[PDB]
């Protein structure tokens, strides 16, 4: 039985579908905000969580969640990456930005492997919620609730998989295993993100204006 | 010659003087801002500077200016540093909090050598004035002038030394050769700051705060 209906997570995924190379990701902040949060509300029981938790989970997942989205989006594209904002990206173009390192991995560890299993929106959505319902986030008022919610998402997603492909008896684990790949790609961006502010210097110590 | 004066720069240093170790520097951000902004307008020829370049220079010099200061203040004590927050850090604590590395370079490379030569407030201020007038600063509306205010300070600084101290005829150069030390410790500090953020709590990617 289900009370984390896959149909709902599908509905949520669909609801948010979109309707200098590097520098172009950064100013998109506002639309990403809306896309993350409108999506999250549409996961069952997310809204039931104490409001103060809701903030953490999103804060926590921000990266991986965005990355998970564009990767799938680009299973259309050829050796490229499509952003929520509609601009495609190419290896020569990216490497001429030092993000070649992300780009490679995005493509060879996510974009291409999703292309490979013909990953679908329900599946992607579910993995996305699993990422969201991340009970290891700091400051959760109650790690355990999130644990439970996490557990339901993957319970239904298992059941889903089995149903739709009784032949591929590994797709569920296959899916779960895209996750460390996704978590590390996220940190790798922060590493770039950070090295850029730092090395760029130029306007580098703008850490003031943290209560300054 | 005082086409750029000295005892005034002393007065300047005198004006701004005050009559868990990491946080304390991230407490006082407001005060340092106080201290630092006034001191610059009290530097001859400083305010005549275009308002825009006044800015670049405070932004660029922030760390050093601020480090040079507490270094010179801790000449006063063996084994530690004294922050403008009216508090005083110790080798054991700093180490215990994982900045022993930066802590030690300050005492070995800046305090001890400032002590060893028994540097005074005209000297201090004059080095600072140097740091403040930095032509290599990014985006100076008029840079090729800023060099002159510097040209003009070190000159005046040759004299103060030349009279007060003619037994030592390279005390001047000895003075300038602490600037590299001060850069490098300025960037080391910056590196730590970026690091701590990075291994920081999920509240690690909050850059999204740039938001435009």
């Amino acid at each position: 039985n289900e009370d984390m209906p896959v149909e709902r997570i599908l509905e949520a995924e669909l609801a948010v579908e979109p309707k200098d190379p590097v520098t172009n990701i950064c100013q998109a902040a506002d639309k990403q905000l809306f896309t993350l949060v409108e999506w999250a509300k549409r996961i069952p029981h997310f809204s039931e969580l104490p409001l103060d938790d809701q903030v953490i989970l999103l804060r926590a997942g921000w990266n991986e969640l965005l990355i998970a989205s564009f990767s799938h989006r680009s299973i259309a594209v050829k050796d490229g990456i499509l952003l929520a904002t509609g601009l495609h990206v190419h290896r020569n173009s990216a490497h001429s930005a030092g993000v070649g390192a992300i780009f490679d991995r995005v493509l060879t560890e996510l974009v291409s492997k999703m292309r490979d299993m013909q990953m679908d929106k329900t599946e992607l959505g579910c993995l996305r919620a699993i990422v969201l319902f991340n009970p290891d986030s700091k400051g959760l008022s109650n790690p355990a609730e999130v644990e439970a919610l996490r557990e339901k998402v993957y319970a239904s997603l298992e059941a889903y998989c089995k149903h739709k492909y009784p032949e591929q008896p590994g797709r569920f684990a296959k899916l779960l295993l895209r996750l460390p790949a996704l978590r590390s790609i996220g940190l790798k961006c922060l590493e770039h993100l950070f090295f850029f502010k730092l090395i760029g210097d130029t306007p580098i110590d703008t850490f003031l204006m943290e209560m300054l | 010659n005082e086409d750029m004066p000295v005892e005034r720069i002393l007065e300047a240093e005198l004006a701004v003087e005050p009559k868990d170790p990491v946080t304390n520097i991230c407490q006082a951000a407001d005060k340092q801002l106080f201290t630092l902004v006034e001191w610059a307008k009290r530097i001859p020829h400083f305010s005549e500077l275009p308002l825009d370049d006044q800015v670049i220079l405070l932004r660029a010099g922030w760390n050093e200016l601020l480090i040079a200061s507490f270094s010179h203040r801790s000449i006063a004590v063996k084994d530690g540093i004294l922050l403008a927050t009216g508090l005083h850090v110790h080798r054991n604590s700093a180490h215990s909090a994982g900045v022993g590395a930066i802590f030690d370079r300050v005492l070995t490379e800046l305090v001890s050598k400032m002590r060893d030569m028994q540097m005074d407030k005209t000297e201090l201020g004059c080095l600072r004035a140097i740091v403040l007038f930095n032509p290599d600063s990014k985006g100076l509306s008029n840079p090729a002038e800023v060099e002159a205010l510097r040209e003009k300070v070190y000159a005046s600084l040759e004299a103060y030394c030349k009279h007060k101290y003619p037994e030592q005829p390279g005390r001047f150069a000895k003075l300038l050769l602490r600037l590299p030390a001060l850069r490098s410790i300025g960037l080391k500090c910056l590196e730590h700051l970026f690091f701590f953020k990075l291994i920081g709590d999920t509240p690690i990617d909050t850059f999204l705060m740039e938001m435009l």
């Binding site: 506002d30 905000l33 804060r59 | 909050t206």
Partner: peptide, 16 residues
């Protein structure tokens, strides 16, 4: 950490 983002996400549940 009551951070000026925390706030903007806070409101964002419900309106921008």
């Amino acid at each position: 950490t009551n951070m000026g983002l925390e706030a903007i996400i806070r409101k964002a549940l419900m309106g921008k």
